[model samples]
Target: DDYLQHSIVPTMHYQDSLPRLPIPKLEDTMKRYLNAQKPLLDDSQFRRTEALCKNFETGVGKELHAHLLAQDKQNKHTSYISGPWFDMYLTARDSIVLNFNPFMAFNPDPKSEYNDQLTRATNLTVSAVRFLKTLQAGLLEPEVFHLNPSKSDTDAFKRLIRFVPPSLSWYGAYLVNAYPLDMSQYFRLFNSTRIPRPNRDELFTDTKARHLLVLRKGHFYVFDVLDQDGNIVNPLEIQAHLKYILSDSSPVPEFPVAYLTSENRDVWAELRQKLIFDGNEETLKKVDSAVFCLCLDDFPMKDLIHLSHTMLHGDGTNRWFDKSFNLIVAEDGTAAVHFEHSWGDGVAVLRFFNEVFRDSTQTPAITPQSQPAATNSSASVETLSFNLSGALKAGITAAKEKFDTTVKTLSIDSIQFQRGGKEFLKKKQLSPDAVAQLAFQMAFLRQYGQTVATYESCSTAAFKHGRTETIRPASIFTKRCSEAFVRDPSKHSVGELQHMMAECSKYHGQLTKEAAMGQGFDRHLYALRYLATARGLNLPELYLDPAYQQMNHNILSTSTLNSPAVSLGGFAPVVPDGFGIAYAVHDDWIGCNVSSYSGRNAREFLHCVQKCLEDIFDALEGKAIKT
Candidate 1:
């Protein structure tokens, strides 16, 4: 049974039935906040922070909570977190390249011959179009996570769910161990772009669009992927157009327009206005309206480490970073996606990534030896040319310099630990995620002799228009455990360390569960702070507390995703000195793709993580610790 659960039902058939995200209880949030602070705070710092919490809970926070509840009551169509979260993203002044965007790379095809850059790009594009058609035509299935697949992923579950009214569908699925995910973000996966604006950016989508955007060597190319009748164009024709762009002899432009998208949002918005007024509005619209982007890079990557850098934010010339997602294929046939984050979370993107990869690889519409369609692809293709004024040209140059500086400062490294994965971890009856997270804690302690604030992103996708809640992984349990493991291995026996790790895993799992349920302190407090600022109220002393500032400085920002279709994923650090760690746990082995600015020693940190994992595995196996 496919847990993705496609049926004759429309992709969004279950959307209306999704639950609204909840706000955690004030007492629960405060208690959790204090517990999270145990590792980061000195005793007096904790005592003072505790007093602020007590005052806020009994005084200012209650009124703020009531105000938030009142505001949340008026918005029943979406989660309470949705509006403020969107505002937070759009209002940020930083460039989206290294600061916000993330990349997920596809596992290469099993049949080596299909890895041809031209062939791989065409099939995935066709598969993506097929997905679009399936979604639009209501032939695709609703996104459902079946906790008990035998019970919920069966045809019996499907038959029962269809008869249940949309309002009652989710409850019915729940009764059968099926969880219908929020599919609201799926619509933005195509024909969508983030338009830059002063102070705040805007997200725009056009469901009626039919064109595909192809980028190569700083040039923009577009062709209709859908015919007038709304049918997907012939695969051969799509292949031919991509081949044309790949072989296009045009030198990289002296002033690539894409660099403009990588600048500070306000700067790009200002330059964007200049371009529009100079009669380039029509050309710009073509870019903002394409179904999605296919970026073809000529660099055959040296390794997955190199691929991480190339896919996440390449030279910024051959990329349009504002698209909802860019399907990038390198000359060596390596394929990955670098997606703009404002449109949606990784859940929507991962669903699309896995489905498209599965569709293209299993039953490809074109083969390596396939001939191009005799139809005139070049005649149909349009190369977008902008009327670049001296003003716009200068912006592009400065943006390019900024882009290069950003790239130069970033370091990316990956590790594929063949020692053990989910299968082996399960044998210990330990949580794989907790093990991985603890390894990170131990690694940081071993490498830098400090345990700072760390973030593990958890999806609240069970709720409508859900965003992420932070699973604070660096906690007291990890602190205690990492010390035993990292500081002096002989201070504790192997069994003793194993027991300590169990404590860490148990608490870590609880934190993950709480975060997934929207009971985390981070977002609630953040929203409260946002509400206070919006209403021009004085800052709560708890927010002004020193511990609060420390908590906000997330030194290790991390996330996890794994699928048969995806080999690795990575993103730049959220903070300048932090590390962005993207990791996955497979059946047989584990993989980590990590990124950091040059200020931090990412390579050394990566080695420590590998060593930590090895030590943990050895301890778990009743061998000598720290081997």
Candidate 2:
């Protein structure tokens, strides 16, 4: 009866039904390819790019397009880009540490008794275990677009926990970690934990364990969290066990092993080999095979910038980035999750933690059993220690220095623009997302003086196993409006500016629709470019062209992830010179996090974002005066 009920709720057979991505017309793509480049290149450079595009259309591109079409028809059920796109993401040159990995922190309930450090940690810990049970039950709903529950991919949620084990080369292959918990079958997989060992790093699952490890004040404690029958231990017992672990916390020598993970992938890969060949293996195995690591941090943070920095890379000693998920509980019961990016995208963790927050806020349907189990069997907690020699100790020191230096390069600014948000935009009949996007474009113009290549992610989840497609937000209309706003505020009449903004808004809407339909130019061009390499053909001049490279450099990388559930969200820049802008729009105000390299005058850009918002309002208000 349980099996039949579970099967009907979260169905996973939708992948075969989703439509495959189609190829765009050669001429239409050629037109989009040129239009995206106009702001970034001069006439002479554009002409050179034009020649390359024309040559490709007449020669190589036609063949590749037909090849893609044939593959599309041959597969019939899969998207053309799915196979190659994922491969490119995994084997890319840049490290996923800060560049690709993103973090999100949840707000603790202000009214709850869990406000105290130990109480909050215990409740959150129990909530996490409950979250796993929900996943085990297959009752978690697949994410959907607003008001439409029917349109969602039920299969992709399962891929969120796929963790890639360590390797000699920087690239490691992905492996599924979550398995069916049938009593008769054991697959050498108990809930697994991730441990960072220098150069030959190891990642394996715990076979005989039902406990999680707690890292508190430079000490490691093994915590048992399951009953004899294999059910999650009750919250009160889990809290009492945690209370005992925290009672006699002593200051110990800090092992900066976790710092190695925050470093560049190549550098970490080389250092990992040295740790295993030159240091302890048994100690490494003990740390690697625990269920997961629970961090009991002393410092509590409320500011968005501080929370973001701590979550991205904590005090250097307490985090293990190799793990798919590391739950960090601060002294104030405030919690933030730091995860490895290779495992899954932000949507995966977003959904998981959203459930945690949702479940924790509601009253329990049933109270747990009153008594703590007489034996320590249900709450077995122990601390694990490492023997650090002179060589390994020195290695840890060097890693901390490198990590500290790299993080100093980041400059993140959180801005709450007082200009009216989604409600005001709706009053004006402008799309809230489009308004915010246009405002950023205008800000970029005011700061950098030109529209560079921009990237915004549009979800393609309608297709089976779908990911994201690039929606180029900087349209020709966007460029014109930005230029008008920058050139002279008084020169353009209010009516003229309003018309330009409307045109820009209309264009943004069109691009978003196209991207969602998988007709966006970026992915089609990317797939063809990768296909050429896969076929052993010489690179097309279209890709080799300087303009093609310049247009996709992504100087302004932004995303609108406004959710009532999410308070603050952002990431570091894709390029050192660019900005990473993730924003949320409330009915009354707009909240944004603008980040860039420290040397790039990130604060000045943030100032411009504020000024542009004011300028746009002035322009809109001018119409009110005339009317």
Candidate 3:
């Protein structure tokens, strides 16, 4: 309770003063582009990209860059990449099932008894409403990254920042190495859903509503979390509502509406429109406009592996993947937050996650011994039934078949590389991120014998209305170093291997810093390419190059996130043959939760990743790697 969340300054206090996301310089982006492509392309292919880059810098790209800057200047209210970024996600018609939705499984309460499903859900729900109220009233503190908390996260700092001009507060925070994040997306977190359209999905948010949706056995139930007086419903009554629902055995629906949400957006869009047209408009609106969905899974998770699979895309029926976020509680009490990506990114989700967990655990609205209040349950809880036409029935059947086939081919695995992690790696003078990324490269090369385009996402939340920028981790340094580790462990001395690792870490560190500061080439190139298309111009040859396309196909879509509240987080691989790697390294160990579409074995790859860490650690400890 002492340090859960900071609400010292109002939530929007520093937003106006947040700096704009900058477009990187032309020459700098070109160099970064070629370097990122070097390891993935051969000599002739690399030369082709070189020529493409040179011509682009001089030719149409110059014009495109100028136009881009002009457009960005005019759109000073938001980041330049915001439109294209939202379009890129919305325009993808694939099912958000294994594609756009991701999950962050929360750690259970410290008191194991509090892990009971009914109790945890009640606590989570009450705390969630409290959080929503805190944020909406602007009483919650602005999200800030304190590089030096002792200096910047202080009473003095807030006093100074609060007095600074609204548009000049960023400078005051920046002076002390404090970085306040973009809180614009936080508004979308509550009362939002991704409404499927023909070619694009729209983000829907309605704050006027006050209900919370709970799903069980593919059945939909809704109740108000906030009373008509606009305060959180009594926690005891909320617990009673949840407890009664958990005990009420309901048969699986002959046609679950939740399954339809997992269909391809275009198909789901049509089906949804039909469902509404056929006299269910108000019901559908209630589902969409509710504050958020709380999934009450009827089964227990067997292990972390099963937990990841269950949380990521559970049976595809008990989940509405398009919700802004689903706070899921299993029958045995495991919990996670699975969310739609189109509305926001991890910075917003993770903050909500940490705050809710801290609030519920530290100062829960209810306790284990808390009894359900005596009330008329029938009045408060209602089961929602849909009227499905014969055509809609056929669509639901087809969606189920497709969902089963997709999830069946998926395999997930987890490994805790206990040899060493952040503390040990940091003491070796290597960036934890760099060493972790290099391990992924070494593992892939060891398992499949080649390097592919790798995607490491870094947030640009330091700027106004910021999103994520790509950090290309596959590089010449990673390739050369991976070879030294996997090709012949006996061929290299401890010193030689050590040298290559440091080289890899150094290069990776630079890329990480660039991407975080919004100076990376990928988003720049992406914006330019998209801009040309937006202006109805013929795509430049640089955009049409095969090397450029290859980079777009990220074979290893990796993201690293850590929090005291989050056990782990995950998503499906961006490509069918790729690995979706959700990893985090703690002070003592590293953990990776990997998912593949079964073309490749994630289990074996995780094995290789562990070996890579062990070997890297061995070298760091002055021991030659074993054959």
Candidate 4:
């Protein structure tokens, strides 16, 4: 209670004077910009980009850089560079569906190994209760850099926890999802509160109710989590509520409204307006305002890959994908989480799960006091039914057709490399994350016979409320080494490969540091380009350059999230032919979920990645690799 009273920790204090994003010198940015383009462009294209960069540096860039510097000085808290960053995420002309938001499946719990539906549901409920408690108390330590916290010295740490639950404006709501159904019946799920400002969306205890909306078998129910006195209801009582809900074997007409969530935002938004116009505002408000959504699925999946795909885009009828967090529990007691990305990055989600998994493992003494003596008939549960009209029915039919067609194009493959991971990388004296990234380049090179563009996320969390910066891992060093390994493995010496790996890793580290400091090329150039548009100025040649387009193609969109508790996580690729490779590394294993569309063949790419990992590890250990 005392800790809860002092909820805001020292690290949670407002960052009053964190340095703003500085304007990079024009010549320097131009040079860095050109270097990024060189690999992606042919000789003629390179010359064109070179001239464009030179023209921008001397003309448009100098004026824009000066303007940025003055604005940076004026903004006391956030970087001037972050304005367009926020705008791009919130107001981008493109839909946020696959290109933006991503989802992941949590690690399977060995404690709930037995395939008992009731036991699994109870464990997840209890863990979620404990996690909410920890979040409310604010007892969790801030996620600081493992190597050094003070070195990065940015204010973005404050914004990390803000991802929990908060309201955002339509103009500013980065994570909102719109849902629409037949005859123009529409509903919006904000994933945050819809209440009036200031008092809206306070976490856990400060919130009005502790009730979660549970969707199962095409039926929706609300289950109260806290007792009359605001204490978390006993675990058994929660289970009793679940047990009561599961007792009903009768089938209900599927709402099919969840399918609308899978639609592109613009299409859904248009259909959403029709739904609102059709009525039922009060019921929609209640569903939107609930704490979070819990999905109790009848299906059973033991494998992590199957589970990940299901949660990512399930049967579509029983899911409200727009909710910020969907805590999904399968019949086999296996659980995974599906979250909307616009609310927060992976770190915030990881922090929430870490607390849940850690606290859930410790068994507290069970007594009558601990297990409340509530019966199923007396438990808190409410069933929600929507009155669908002719238009709404038609809408649902169309949505189902569209979603099924779109999802059919997607191909995913999850692979676990048995031999190497963190321990193995340590033995070879290579950065674990860096080695994994390089393997992606190698895999792409060997498979495609050319080095494709890559995008790796580098956290800007060291800065105030920072999210992520693009860390392009492909370099000339990576290109040469991977080409050598792929072309003629026997000719290249182990020492030569090791040196190249070190250089590649070192450059990645440097890029990460620069990105956190707001010196990254992508966001800066984006801001300048967008600023010109905002000011009604003619488009600059730098932006129109082919090299710029080639650099941002992001053919290999890879991210490494090393969570032992999360088996696999994935998202649709940013580009049509690219692969979305979300990977995690444990002590002795590396697990990757590769996703692609447009006939990219995730399975083949995964196999190639497996071979690359083996060859790289063998090369690092000075052993001859298998051809």
Candidate 5:
């Protein structure tokens, strides 16, 4: 693809001269050690977990993946986070060990705000899923490759490789990011037993959860409705409904008892019928959708330890301790839910999201139906300038150009790689120091120990990049986004951006607490770790509204939403007017909207985001950045 031409593109290898980065520093070396070390839980918790697994020996429920697929083949209308969906499955499997209820995990909201929280949670989940839309718009046109057959910089070729890595290691490591689910989101939700309704109803009623399934014939298909806003549907029921709509008659395995509450028992048993719950018609009604049940025939509810054993695959990852202790329910009528994980990693799971999400939208070949709508620049760019001194001084300059070029390059080089049986790591020469440096930088090196936080990131290049210019690169101690930036700093560096975001949240959290008498927005809650702490009103949320959601959803669901491989040098910055300037925007490992990719500079990120607030005068003025 002539990536060396320097127009900026993806690569099988960034550059031969690209400094070999095996745990080249303290942080990277530490990360390798941590990654190698398999940690477990306290003896008491292990005992309880073992007992539960014994009980579910026969495997009480159908596999959750199977359940989701059943719904998909049946043409369900909900969008599911591919790996987190599995995380829930893992969580459910482990629940059998602690003698806790999985279905009820969704219950016992601490905020006593089930209705509002559901709306918010639903909206939040949908909003996050909808990032697929923005990703679709940024895809390069198809004919660019055919027309310029010899052009070498074709978009499709780059996307195919950039997103997939040489090995699934990145994909495997993604489980680390899932901490938000185990620690923060579930912890908050589990402890605070109340589920709040969304501030608005449409947040739930108008959103969709489409299914991604692989048929026995080995073909992939999506079950969805075009105008999801008008469809007040429940995912479980919608899956049942869509099975027929999509005209597939595949019989899905029944969900096991572990996955169900006594309330949903009958629904799990009564399949062959669509089980969608319509908000307008069946509001407040609980329908039959148990994605996390034990398989009675193969995985009975009693074998908790065995199930955990199978699920854990003996590799040593677990969260949640002490037999699933319940959180205290607040006097405010909010119930605190119990959240625990015995073994899991966030990096592996998120990487799974990155991969499967792409698979969900890709078609076997290019077609007219594949093209996404042109992006609407209306609200993205603005004149509001905000200082990005840290970024500039830190040697991280320019957001849009860097990000776009990196992404474009990644698109050219697929990220996936195939390795041999049980010998992949054995064959490689590893630099423990570099690995440790990354580990330390990512905050995973010392899970329970305390030490000086070292300067670390996905690469020494980022660290070196900081060194090149006099300004210090924000010590991007995070592994996820930093690795992304290293892969392609310009468009694919969300980790560095997130580190700054943490800073912004901290600043706002302190102010909110001070102004509200310590009732400040808890920054930790808002940390990507806790579900209850995080708010769903991100850049993607604005796209889910009725006026824009359909087109928004389509672009996301369309075939072009693949992410490219990583590179470190392509990042650049942009200065937008009025709506503030683009921040330290870069490509996130999880992917970001090209429109807002440059808004990583805290001030610019906020400004670009804030203008999305729908105002009568603003709408009337009709000033927007139509991409």
Candidate 6:
């Protein structure tokens, strides 16, 4: 039943037994998703990730596995898994083939200058991968979750992890990649409408025109953009809209693995009834309005000759953008909105939208304002945050103090910190592209990162202290060294790894007391974090690290409305379990993130964040990392 009938399938077969299709392995797809260039070390809590992962694997101090096993029988597996790590075995295998990777990235307008749907596709990819990694072992800890071990923990467990990707995007970018959060399981599990009751299937039917086209060659993808007028937008022309295309498109081109005919239902029905309908009737919906003549043009083979033929044919499709972007054309057609989800989040998208009218063109289009176009900013490098409550903050403080006091006393070379790693960690030290590839791998592990809470016992009194939120670049220097790693993997050899230790030497440089205390303006308030007080009052706090704040002023900006509508604008906000404060910052072109607090106290969260930035910076220097 899963297999399509003949004539519906492509002919002219290739080497593989399976039909020719244009889609990458899920891992590759994830790798492409992570190709985004931004502040990883700064924003991604990699330092805490390193510490957390190390602790978990080592069976040493307090960690997720250790505590989870104490309370839950199901979590006991970690005790014996020393180095026997659990990986989220992800294989998109036939997902593209079975579902048909139709090009959903909508085009703004053909008449006005614009890019192809690839931007939106890239945005989706980054967003999806980001969510996948948010819960990765290195970035998150058991202590950082909402682990209510009640009888309903199983249902709660699935619900908890489900929000990572969408929640991250909703709070951060104000855009959601996975639709209807529960849409993934709509048939099996009904997702009640969060807002009022407009039917779930409203847009799924044929009353509207959601026109999209899929062109493929072998495994290549070529997404065609169509307007209400039935005209097509060339992909190359779309390329012209970008500042500088980061990653090159694959050589092959093929139609979407899945496609629905874009031809109007009336036209298709009339033609099909005369030919093959056999008196059966079908209906069209709002999607058919624009999604006319959906076709998945793919080759039957993988070799170059067949791949070329498949790509050239009208049925071919190819993936184009390395970066991710999303589009929102006002239903009114008066305004066009675009967003980049990789570097920015919902906040950035909103900012871009607000500024769209500011651009010279009468028609609204967003242009990003980040340097190196997609490069992470300088301020994103060394900032940190901490909360007054929670024992984890103590751990982070202890770790940082360990680095400052112990490591500083050692006089280790700055370069040595980066270079002193084995094969696995070596890849981590490689460039943004290499690390981007790791993001793909982590995407798989993110599945397990969602085990809710693990019971832990500590002697400390319930937390009470001054809460702080700060951020700095994760590791701009690590980014540079990672880039270098790409050019020379040999540099990661054992000898070279030892040499990379030089990076650690720089940590000893003490800032002048005046420099340390002066203004503290280096950390400007970019976003806010709130915590629940002993008095039951919720207080708001601010963050001012460039790393904590998105460097790009305009990441995923658009002119879209702020309504909580599910279809348009984007979904409403979602907070992580246990965290009291959530943050949302809007840059002109893109939104960075909207993070909610979890179990970690405010200061603990930021301090964990600071360690993340510092680790990434050290990573860029070719250092060995915990992950």
Top candidate (lDDT): 3
Clashes of 2: 7
Error of 4 at 570 (Å): 1.4
Write model 1 residue lDDT over 328-438, tens digit each, in one string. Answer: 998878999899998778687888898888988888879999998887767999988989899988888899898887789999888889998999898998999999999
lDDT of 3 at 69: 96
What does the lDDT come to for candidate 3?
0.90
Error of 3 at 266 (Å): 1.0
Q: How many residue pairs clash in each candidate?
A: 2, 7, 0, 18, 203, 149
- In candidate 6 the C-alpha lDDT for residue 351 amounts to 27
Query: lDDT of candidate 6 vs native?
Result: 0.23
Q: Which stretches of candidate 3 lie over 4 Å from their true place?
A: 1-6
- The whole-model lDDT of each prediction reads 0.88, 0.67, 0.90, 0.66, 0.22, 0.23
The estimated TM-scores of all candidates read 0.98, 0.83, 0.98, 0.85, 0.19, 0.20
Scored against the true structure, residue 252 in model 6 reaches a CA lDDT of: 39
462-519: candidate 3 lDDT, tens digit per residue: 9998999999999899999999988888888999888999999998888888898998
For model 4, the local distance difference test gives: 0.66
Q: State, as a TM-score between 0 and 1, how close model 6 is to the true structure.
A: 0.20
Q: Kindly list the per-residue Cα lDDT of model 5 for residues 221-326, writing each as its tens digit.
A: 2223112452323332223332222243433312111121111212322211122221112311111111110110112223222222222111111111221222
How accurate locally is residue 453 in candidate 3, as Cα lDDT from 0 to 100? 93
Q: Which ten-residue region of model 1 has the weakest summed lDDT?
A: 1-10
- In model 1, pairs of residues that clash are 6-141, 7-141
